[PDB]
Design a binder for this molecule. Sequence first.
Ligand SMILES: Nc1ncnc2c1ncn2[C@@H]1O[C@H](COP(=O)(O)OP(=O)(O)OP(=O)(O)O)[C@@H](O)[C@H]1O
Ligand SMILES: Nc1ncnc2c1ncn2[C@@H]1O[C@H](COP(=O)(O)OP(=O)(O)OP(=O)(O)O)[C@@H](O)[C@H]1O
Ligand SMILES: [Mg+2]
Ligand SMILES: [Mg+2]
Lengths: 343, 343, 51
Amino acid sequence: STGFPLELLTRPATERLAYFENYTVAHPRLKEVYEILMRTIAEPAGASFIFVYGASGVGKTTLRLRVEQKLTELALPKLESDRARVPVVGIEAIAPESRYFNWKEYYTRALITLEEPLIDHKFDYGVRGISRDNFGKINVESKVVAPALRRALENALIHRHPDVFFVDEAQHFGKVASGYKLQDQLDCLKSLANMTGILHCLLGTYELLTFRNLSGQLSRRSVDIHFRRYCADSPEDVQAFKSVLLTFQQHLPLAETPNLVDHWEYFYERTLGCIGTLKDWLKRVLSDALDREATTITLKDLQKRALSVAQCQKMFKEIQEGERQLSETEADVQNLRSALGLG
Amino acid sequence: STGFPLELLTRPATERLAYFENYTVAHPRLKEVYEILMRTIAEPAGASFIFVYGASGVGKTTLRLRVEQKLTELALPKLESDRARVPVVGIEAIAPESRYFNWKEYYTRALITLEEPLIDHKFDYGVRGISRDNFGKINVESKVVAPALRRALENALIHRHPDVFFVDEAQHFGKVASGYKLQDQLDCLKSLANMTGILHCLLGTYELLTFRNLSGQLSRRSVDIHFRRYCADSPEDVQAFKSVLLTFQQHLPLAETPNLVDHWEYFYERTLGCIGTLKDWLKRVLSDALDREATTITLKDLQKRALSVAQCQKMFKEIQEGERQLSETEADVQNLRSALGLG
Amino acid sequence: CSEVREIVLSLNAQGVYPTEGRVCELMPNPGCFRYKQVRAAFNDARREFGL
Ligand SMILES: Nc1ncnc2c1ncn2[C@@H]1O[C@H](COP(=O)(O)OP(=O)(O)OP(=O)(O)O)[C@@H](O)[C@H]1O
Ligand SMILES: Nc1ncnc2c1ncn2[C@@H]1O[C@H](COP(=O)(O)OP(=O)(O)OP(=O)(O)O)[C@@H](O)[C@H]1O
Ligand SMILES: [Mg+2]
Ligand SMILES: [Mg+2]
């Protein structure tokens, strides 16, 4: 059938919780974003940046994990012929403890994650500091200057040549002091991606919109992908949300299947249409149900682990601003054509 | 029985004083906040922060101690065989001597507190400078830069995977410069908590509301828990306060039990309904009673060790200001629905 | 040269950074590096290990 296996009822609550945690819904928004992102990754064609915007809880991180897994699967057949070739490497930007983003730490961690397939391969980078140890992990001395780490990372990236460089939480690149232009820190990555030839995919929330269009060079070498939530105005998105809720209800490991579609307004209100937030909410409610060994889900149980009205209002405010910044209409196209003199 | 053991009357004043100090009472607010905290810790489900707002003297620290003890007791059967795991690690933020919060000292003390399980457990930090000295204590060289300490703490937290990283007195994170945004400090904590995957619980007074809903990402990954005080504006909290006064008066180690319910207005006046303040007031009054060897407790004894009106009028103002921003009404829900267009 | 290599091995085993001074501290005559192949052996051993 289309629901969860009936054998799981006799399994312990931990097994049911793990099964629900590992479950993933292929809703239309995630599917479309996946196709667009993998088509862009398969051939960048001059672009050096991919901006995957989206709300908090849309599913950007799981999209990155899925793309990484499928890229590794596709590179497995070709890895038998050409060795020492990482298919995909992905890191996460660090929110600095100081007023400036630490580029030295970024280079160090990029080198650590990129250059650790296994001990069977050695490259002998051009800088003295970087080396492996007896434990099999790269350790970089604190005396290595940042430009030297940059050169070492560039050489390693050229040698390994990953298909794409994932940078999760790219909004942390905006942590600069007053008087520091956000363009400069984007060119710091653009130069590396240009002299190295590796596509960089930036995944972040609507705070990443400060890096949207900073210069003509950074607008040419950028692909804009919007991980969109589900709206309530358009009936199609409402139907998609209801279908996702129904699929979640079929795959909830409970003795009696709860009725969950009818309270769709309450779910959209406290989730804002994001499938990740709804999945987290249902996971919490399922954990509570299994804690008491309940047989269904009750409205009050959902009311327990629901995000507060203030939190939802804040997320909706930032979602509104981000969607307003990212909305493209025919008026903008016509204005662009009129400016270009294409009448 | 329902009171203190009758054998304690023949024991010295030290034993009775210690018995009163170690006694705890399970009032409804504490049990509700504890159940909510433990349900959130068990299944964070995409939450990296747990804010526990409460008045100064409601019992946040004893709640943290109880949660840590119960988590350790839960992990002990599994810790009998499995090793190299810490169930819960707790730290307290430090008010800086300078104007800015010291992140380097937070990483140092977090590393010291977390990594003292046993001398046998040796794990490689990957950063030169941190080791164990001849006394079996973690020593960090003063030349180790804060990003290196952060990386070492990240590796240790991933290796030990504690259930929750308690951060008491988290309002001291707000000791930042006038040009420093409070969102950046929360982003720095969130980045660690997210790469480490370790849940962080921030306990503090109503000054911690300055860290509430700074962004949509810090709102979705947040579970706000309010340690509410007892209010005289509703009969239910008044009855609960009277019951807790009754059990306190029957658990006071005295020859004659003092009558506290009749002077309940006086106790509420100087404690604002908080339980820790009342407990410390009764502890002081009992200490003075036993110093003189008093057979009971008189009102004048309570006035001797009470809190001044000027003292109480400031804590009460802070409680009003905090509870104003922590109240959710139907109007907010309707506003959220209207903003989402769910009407 | 053989003791130089062995000492750099022992020093890198414990994780402490092997420098010329630290190795010299563990030699009976901490002046043998003036010979221009003892230093060469130390440099080669460090560079083989990644320094
Ligand atoms: N399509 C999906 N199907 C099932 N679960 C999903 C889906 N998308 C996200 N999740 C769940 O959401 C959680 C991860 O959060 P998510 O990937 O949505 O965050 P994000 O928006 O990428 O990150 P951030 O909020 O930090 O910006 C996991 O519990 C994961 O199972
Ligand atoms: N429920 C309780 N039963 C008994 N004693 C309690 C209870 N809650 C708190 N206390 C006592 O109150 C005193 C101080 O309270 P506690 O340290 O828990 O408060 P806190 O909320 O952390 O305060 P602050 O924010 O002002 O530091 C201690 O002596 C503690 O034993
Ligand atoms: Mg993420
Ligand atoms: Mg305290």
